[PDB]
Amino acid sequence: AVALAGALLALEVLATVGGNLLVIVAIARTPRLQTMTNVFVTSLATADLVVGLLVVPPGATLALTGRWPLGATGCELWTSVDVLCVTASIETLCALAVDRYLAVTNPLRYGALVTKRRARAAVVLVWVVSAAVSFAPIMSEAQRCHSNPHCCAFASNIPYALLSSSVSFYLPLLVMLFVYARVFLVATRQLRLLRRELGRFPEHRALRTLGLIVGTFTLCWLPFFVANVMRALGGPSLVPSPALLALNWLGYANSAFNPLIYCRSPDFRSAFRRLL
Amino acid sequence: QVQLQESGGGLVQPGGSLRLSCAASGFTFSNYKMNWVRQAPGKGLEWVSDISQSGASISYTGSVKGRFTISRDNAKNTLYLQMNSLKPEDTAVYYCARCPAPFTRDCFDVTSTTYAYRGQGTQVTVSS
Amino acid sequence: AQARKLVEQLKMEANIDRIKVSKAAADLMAYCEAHAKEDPLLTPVPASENPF
Amino acid sequence: QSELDQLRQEAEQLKNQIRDARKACADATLSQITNNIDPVGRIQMRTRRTLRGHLAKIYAMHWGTDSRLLVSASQDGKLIIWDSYTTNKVHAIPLRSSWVMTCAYAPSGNYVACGGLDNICSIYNLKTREGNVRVSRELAGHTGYLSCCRFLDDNQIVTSSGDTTCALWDIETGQQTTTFTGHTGDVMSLSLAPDTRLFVSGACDASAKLWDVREGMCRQTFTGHESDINAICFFPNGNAFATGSDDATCRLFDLRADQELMTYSHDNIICGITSVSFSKSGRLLLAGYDDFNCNVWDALKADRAGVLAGHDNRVSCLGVTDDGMAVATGSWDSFLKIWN
Amino acid sequence: TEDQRNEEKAQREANKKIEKQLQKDKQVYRATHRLLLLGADNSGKSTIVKQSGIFETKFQVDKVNFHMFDVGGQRDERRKWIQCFNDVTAIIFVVDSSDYNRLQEALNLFKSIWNNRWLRTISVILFLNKQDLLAEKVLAGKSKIEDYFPEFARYTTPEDATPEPGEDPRVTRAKYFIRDEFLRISTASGDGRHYCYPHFTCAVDTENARRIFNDCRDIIQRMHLRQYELL
Ligand SMILES: O=C(O)c1cccc(-c2cccc(NCCNC[C@@H](O)c3cccc(Cl)c3)c2)c1
C-alpha cells in the first residue's frame, strides 16, 4: 500500500492540524464562543491536534516501512503519548455527552450545576486519568521485538489490555450510548408535542444528529478495540498486526473528523468566516 | 409634519351608507399599516380594522365584521372605509390612525389615549 | 385654554430670527474645514502619538 | 367650543406664514453648494480595544471629560467605570434597580448618574473619604420611564423621561427648578450644547424641540421626520444638530435656518437609527443602526464613507471622546468595543 | 518611574479584586430567571402574586430562584420601554376572558407582542384569570359571544378538550373558543423559536407558580435542543 499512502497521510495530517488549530483559535480568540461547554471541545481539539501532529506521521512511516526510525525509547514515548491522547479524546467525548445530558434533562439547574471552574476541573481530571492509564507500561509475540531489534511492540499482556479497553473505550461507549438514548427519547417527545400543538388548524432532525455522532464515533473506534481484545485473549494468529495498524489508522481518522462533527453550529461557522 | 385629515359624514338613519376619506400627506404612505379606531361617547378607545402595506392582509373587529370595507390607494396617498348596514352602536368618532414604525408586521400601541400619528377625527352618528 | 395656549405658543416660534439656508450652509462647512486639522478620525495621526 | 375653531383657523393661517417664511428663506439645498469639496474617502476603522465585563445588554455609555475614563450602563445592576487605555475597571457600582436605560459622567469627573425604568435618576459619588462608592441623591419627581440625562454642572443635571417632559434638576436639594412641557409622546434622547446655554430633546412624535435651560420655555420646533426619535446630538459648532429616527433616515437640522438640511438615507437600509454622534470637527457622523453594525456618514455629502462591524447584536449607544481621539460603541451583546 | 509603576500595579490589584466580585455575581445572575408581567387593568395580574415604576416579586419554587416583576408606573404607550425585556426567560401574559368587549383589544396586544422584531424570540405564557365570571356570564345567557365574535356560531368543541367534572358544555365551548382565538394568533407566525402556553385559572387557584416552573423548564429545554441542532 504505497500508491494511496501519500494522499491519505497528507489529507489526514494536514486536515487534522488545520481543523484543530481553527477550532482552538476560534474558541480562544472569540469571547462569544467561550461557553460553559466549549472547554470540553477545547480539550478534544487539543488531543486531536496532538494526535494528528506528532502521532500520525510516525505511525504512517512504520506502517509503510516496517522499520522504526527512532530508538526503543523514542517509540516507547510515542506509545505512551498516543495512548494518553486517544484516551483523553474518548473520555472528553464522554464528558461532552454527560454535559449535553445535564443541559437537556436539567435545563433550569444547568448554569448553576456545572460552572466554568467545575468544567475545567473535570477536563483536568480526564487528562490526568488518561496520563495515569497511559504511563502504566513505563512502570511495573512473547517479548520478541521489544529488545530493540529495530522493532518495538505494542503487544501487551492481557491485564493491561483489559484495563485499557475498559477505561478508554468501553465505559465511554456505554455512557455515550445510554446518555444519548435518553436525549433521543426526550427530543422525540418534544418534537411530537411541538408538531401536535402547531398543526391543530385546518421532519426528523434529532435522529440525524445523534446517529451521526454515535456512528462517526463507533464505526471508527469499535473495530480497533475489538481487534485489540481478541488479539490479547487469543494471540497473534487470530489477527495479523497490519490489520490492527489499519484499524488504528481509522481511529486517527476519527480524531481528524472530531472537529467537524462538534463545530457545526452557525456561531462556529460565522467565527470561521471572520477568521478566513 | 405628519397629518391625517378626514372627511366623513354626519346624522344618517340606521341601515344607510357612509364613506370615510382619509387624506394623508407628509409621509411615505406605502410603508405604513394604517388602522381605524373609534371612540363611542362616554367610552374608551377601541380598534376597528387594519390593512397591510399593499392591501393584502385585512382584518376586522368582530362587531364591525361583515359590514365595513377598508381599502387603501397607495398611488394617491389616501385611505378609505366604506360602511353599510349601520347599527345604533356605530355612533362614535373615527380616527385614521397610522403605524409607529415602517415594515413591522405588528402595529404596537395604536389605541393609546395620547398618540402622535393620529388624525383629528370626524363624528359619525346614527339616529332618527 | 388648551388651544389658546397652542396658538400663542406657535406664534412664539413665528418670531424666531431666520436666515437663508444657502448662507447657513456655508457656515456649517467652513467650521469643518477650519477644524479639519485637529480631527484624528478625519486625518489619521502617527501611531507613536496614538494612545490606544 | 366655538372660540377654539377661530383660534385654530388663525393658528393654521399663521403656521402657513412660517412655512412661507421657511420657503422664502430656502435658497438651495446644502448638497448643491457642497459638491465641489473633496470626499473623505473610505475610513479604515478597526477594533483597537474591546471591553468585556458585563453580563447582559449595554444600553448607554458616556465618555469622561478627560477622554480616558468611560462609564457604561448595562441592564444588570452594574455601573462599571472602565479605564480605556489599560482596560482596567476602576469601579463597579452596584445599582438598586437592574433596568437602567441611561448613564452620564460629570464634566468635573467626580459624579456619575444613571437610572431607567425605576423612574429615579440616582446620582453616585465617586471620590469619597470613606473608601467606598455611595449614592449622593435620589431624584424622584418623574412619572414615566427615564430615558436620558446629561450633566450640565456638578449640580445641574438635566433629565429627560417618558412623561413627554424634560426637567432641570438641582442636585443640592433634589427639587425640579424647571420643567419643560410641550411634547406629545415619549422623549428618548437629548444633547446639551457645548456652551450649555440651551439644549434639544428628541421625542417619540417625529419632532425635535429647542429648550432653554434658564428661561424654561420651548424656543424652536423641528418636525420633518417620520417616526420616533431615538437619538440626537449637536454639531460641534453648537449651532446645528442631526438626529436619527426609527425610519432608517438621519436628518441634519440648522437652528438659524429653521429647516431640514440633509436626508442621510440609503435606498437599502430599513433598520432605524439608535445612536448619533459627531467627530471633533463634525465631518464624520457616526450613526448606529439595528442591522447589527454602525456607519460613518460624511456629514457634508450624505454619501456613506466606511462601514464598521464586529457586533453580533444591535448597537444602542455610540459615544465620541472629548478630544475626538476614539469612538466607543456598546451593543446589546454585552460587548463595549473601543474604536480608533 | 517608581511612582508611575505603583499606579498601573495598583489598578491591576483593583481590577483583580473587582473581577473576583463580578464573577461571584455572574453565577448568581445566570441562576435567576426574569419574567415580564403585563395584562389588562382589571385582568388581575396582582392576583397571581400570592408569595415606583417596577414592582418586583421574587419567589423560590423547587429551589430555583425566579424574578417576576410588573411594570405599572409608565403610561399607556409601550412601544419604547418594552424592548428592554428581550432577555427575559418568558413573558407572562395574563388576560381576563369575562369581559368580551375588552377581548379584541387584548388580542391586538398579544399579536403586537408576537410579531415584534426584538420580541420574536420570547415565549409568551398565556393566562386566563376570570373563569368564574366567564362561566356565570354564558350560563346566564344575557350576553352573547356571537354579537362580539360572529365566528363563534360555527365553532365546535375540540376533540382534545378536557372539560372539568360538573361543567356545562356551553362553558367549555366558550372557554376553548377564546383559547383557540389566541392560539390562532401565535401559530400563524411561530417560527419555532417562541411559543404560547395557554392556561386556565380562577382567582382562588393555589398552584399558579408551579404552572410557570413546569413551563419555564419546557421553554429552556426547547431552547437547548434548538441550539444544539437537535430539535
Ligand atoms: O510485534 C510485532 O512484531 C509488531 C510489528 C509491527 C507492528 C506491531 C504493532 C502492534 C500493535 C500496535 C501497533 N501500533 C499501534 C500503537 N498505537 C496504539 C494507539 O493508537 C492506541 C489507541 C487506542 C487505545 C490504545 Cl490502548 C492505544 C503496532 C507489532
Experimental method: cryo-EM
Pair D123, D171: CB distance under 8 Å = yes
Quick one: D109 exposed, middle or buried, by C-beta within 10 A (0-12, 13-18, 19+)? middle
- Measured CA to CA, the distance from residue E9 to residue E66 in angstroms comes to 40
Task: Tell me the three cell numbers of residue E199.
Answer: 392556561
Query: Quick check: CB of A130 below 6 Å from ligand 1?
Result: no
CA-based nearest residue in chain D for residue A31: D52
* Domain, as residue range, for A126: 1-276
- Measured CA to CA, the distance from residue B26 to residue A217 in angstroms comes to 65
- Measured CA to CA, the distance from residue A28 to residue D25 in angstroms comes to 60
CA distances from E217 to A103, A107, A242, E62, E87 (A): 11, 6, 52, 11, 16
* Probe site for chain E from D80, D117, D120, D163 (most E CB atoms < 10 A): D117
Question: How many alpha carbons fall within 13 Å on the CB side of residue A137?
Answer: 23
Work out the angle at residue B21's Cα, subtended by the Cα atoms of residues B19 and B27, and round it to the nearest 5 degrees. Answer: 155
Q: Which of D230, D220, D235, D241 is nearest to D314 (CA)?
A: D230
Q: Give SS3 for D33.
A: helix
CA A155 to the chain's CA centroid: 22
Which residues neighbour E57 within 8 Å (Cβ) at sequence distance 6 or greater?
E49, E51, E68, E69, E70
Q: What does residue B69 show for φ and ψ, rounded to 5 degrees?
A: -120, 125
- Based on its alpha-carbon atoms, the radius of gyration of chain C, rounded to whole angstroms, reads 22
Quick one: D77 exposed, middle or buried, by C-beta within 10 A (0-12, 13-18, 19+)? middle
Q: Are strands E32-39 and E90-95 parallel, antiparallel or unpaired?
A: parallel
**Number of domains observed in the structure of chain A:** 1
- Contact of A36 with chain E, judged by CB distance below 8 Å, is answered with no
* Domain, as residue range, for D319: 1-339
Neighbouring subunits of E (3+ Cβ pairs under 8 A): A, B, D
Task: Tell me the three cell numbers of residue C29.
Answer: 462647512
Nearest to C31 among D40, D48, D282 (CB): D282
Bridge partner list, D50: D337
Which residues neighbour C42 within 8 Å (Cβ) at sequence distance 6 or greater?
C36, D40, D279, D281, D283, D284
Neighbouring subunits of A (3+ Cβ pairs under 8 A): D, E
| Residue D333 to residue A32, Cβ atoms within 8 A | yes
- Measured CA to CA, the distance from residue C9 to residue E102 in angstroms comes to 38
Task: Tell me the three cell numbers of residue D111.
Answer: 459624579
Q: Residue of the nearest CA to atom 24 in ligand 1?
A: A83
- Measured CA to CA, the distance from residue A45 to residue A17 in angstroms comes to 9
Q: Which of D295, D223, D233 is nearest to D265 (CA)?
A: D295
Q: Residue of the nearest CA to atom 15 in ligand 1?
A: A245
| Residue E77 to residue D186, Cβ atoms within 8 A | yes
Which residue has 372627511 as its cell numbers? B7
> In Å, what resolution does this model reach?
3.9
**Number of domains observed in the structure of chain D:** 1
- DSSP letter assigned to residue B116: S
Task: Tell me the three cell numbers of residue D56.
Answer: 447582559
Architecture of domain B3-126: Sandwich (2.60)
E strand or H helix that includes residue A21: helix A5-28
Work out the angle at residue A164's Cα, subtended by the Cα atoms of residues A178 and A114, and round it to the nearest 5 degrees. Answer: 45
Chain D stretch 194-233, residues whose beta carbon is closer than 8 A to a beta carbon of chain E: 204, 228
- Measured CA to CA, the distance from residue A106 to residue A86 in angstroms comes to 30
- Contact of C5 with chain D, judged by CB distance below 8 Å, is answered with no
Which residues neighbour C52 within 8 Å (Cβ) at sequence distance 6 or greater?
D48, D49, D84, D85, D325, D326, D338, D340
Residue A159: what residue type?
P
Task: Tell me the three cell numbers of residue D173.
Answer: 436639594
| Residue C35 to residue D257, Cβ atoms within 8 A | no
- Contact of E16 with chain D, judged by CB distance below 8 Å, is answered with no
Pair E185, A76: CB distance under 8 Å = no
- Measured CA to CA, the distance from residue E231 to residue E220 in angstroms comes to 12
